[PDB]
Sequence to fold (202 residues):
Amino acid sequence: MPGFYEIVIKVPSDLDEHLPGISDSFVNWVAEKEWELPPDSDMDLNLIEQAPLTVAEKLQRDFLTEWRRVSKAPEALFFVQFEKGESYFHMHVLVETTGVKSMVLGRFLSQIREKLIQRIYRGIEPTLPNWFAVTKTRGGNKVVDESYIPNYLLPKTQPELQWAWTNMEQYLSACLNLTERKRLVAQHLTHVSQTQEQNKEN
Ligand SMILES: [Mg+2]
Fold:
């Protein structure tokens, strides 16, 4: 029943351009990490860029830890999709509204952003233009329902799709399985159609 806020987080992909002044240890940390697909995945690992993924995995993991603390919702539902855009790697973070009133969201997000800078970037802010941004109505903070996910996130394919994470049960297999995403999209649109059909009838 509750909606979701959306935070878009840009992820650096060019060290000198995106992250001027970053530490050597940060560079080594990125280099060291390797990721593998789960056995049930049908994705092509070749199309997935490991270094940006390392940064993204931590950013989402840390954002969520902070969110749980400010929200006081330990079990908050989330869906995060990491994507390769035309200009930037970026992350769509959808998190439920519970525990955070809209009036105070800017202050909380701001606190979270500082924590990410400390933890991920080791005190050096990324040189990305509007890097941590809540989706707004023009206006106030946008809230969207669960339908946003089948409509705008699930349809993505490689290489635009890089990775995804969730705690929402209906999407757990969808995250890294293209065949499953495809099925879910079709299923959602089917429901929508059936609903309109009913409406015309009656
Ligand atoms: Mg996008």
Notes: Residues 1-202 form a domain with the Replication Protein E1; Chain: A, fold (CATH 3.40.1310.20). The radius of gyration is 18 Å. The longest helix spans residues 178-200. The pocket of magnesium ion is lined by residues 83, 85 (CB under 6 Å).
